[PDB]
Amino acid sequence: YGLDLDCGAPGTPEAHVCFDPCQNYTLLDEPFRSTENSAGSQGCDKNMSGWYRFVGEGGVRMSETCVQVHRCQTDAPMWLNGTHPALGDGITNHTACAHWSGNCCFWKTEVLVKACPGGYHVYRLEGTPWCNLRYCTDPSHH
Ligand SMILES: *[C@@H]1O[C@H](CO)[C@@H](O)[C@H](O)[C@H]1NC(C)=O
Ligand SMILES: *[C@@H]1O[C@H](CO)[C@@H](O)[C@H](O)[C@H]1NC(C)=O
């Protein structure tokens, strides 16, 4: 990835093919991701790949603060150990932390975040480091 665009696999004939993540994401409207949701059969975001936008009642952004365990329809909820970028900051690299066993960063993994025209953010999410972990959404951001 570059300042504004993400590109194809290095070392392949698609390595020069780049796109704006703000125009090429998977849309998720999954209220169960809410940091306030304590129900549901725990699941795991192990299959995630590429860029994602979150919408709906569960919230439109990842949480910037540690989430209590057994929220977001998962066991170890994941939150953004960083500050969201502003539009014009480009693609930014961040740490996501999973809360477990008295440790708000028991697991960590890299996530990319970009602010987009129209007042939304997109996230590049590549699996999880363990299960059951999920990337939560904060419903305070409507
Ligand atoms: C969208 O991004 C994925 C990777 O997340 C890529 O494989 C695909 O080619 C992209 N599509 C377009 C139209 O840019
Ligand atoms: C990540 O979280 C820890 C614990 O709150 C904090 O010390 C650190 O400054 C955070 N890092 C960023 C980039 O926000």
Numbering used by the authors: 42 to 183
Which of the paper's sentences describe this entry?
Glycoprotein 2 (GP2) and uromodulin (UMOD) filaments protect against gastrointestinal and urinary tract infections by acting as decoys for bacterial fimbrial lectin FimH. By combining AlphaFold2 predictions with X-ray crystallography and cryo-EM, we show that these proteins contain a bipartite decoy module whose new fold presents the high-mannose glycan recognized by FimH. The structure rationalizes UMOD mutations associated with kidney diseases and visualizes a key epitope implicated in cast nephropathy.
The electron density maps reveal that the GP2 branch is a protein module (henceforth referred to as ‘decoy module’) that consists of a β-hairpin stabilized by a disulfide bond (Cx48-Cy59), packed against a globular ‘D10C’ domain with a new fold including two 310 helices, nine β-strands (βA–βI) and five intermolecular disulfides (C163-C8157, C285-C9172, C3107-C6145, C4113-C10177, C5138-C7146). Interestingly, although the GP2 branch also binds FimHL, its D10C domain cannot be glycosylated at the position corresponding to UMOD N275 (R165). In agreement with these considerations, introduction of an N65A mutation in the decoy module of GP2 impairs its interaction with FimHL and mass spectrometric analysis of the glycans attached to N65 detects the HexNAc2Hex5 oligomannose structure, indicating that UMOD and GP2 exploit a common molecular strategy to counteract bacterial adhesion. Because of 60% sequence identity to UMOD, the crystal structure of the latter immediately explains the effect of many substitutions affecting invariant positions. Remarkably, most of these mutations cluster within two structurally important regions of the decoy module, the β-hairpin/D10C domain groove and the disulfide bond-rich region at the opposite end of D10C.
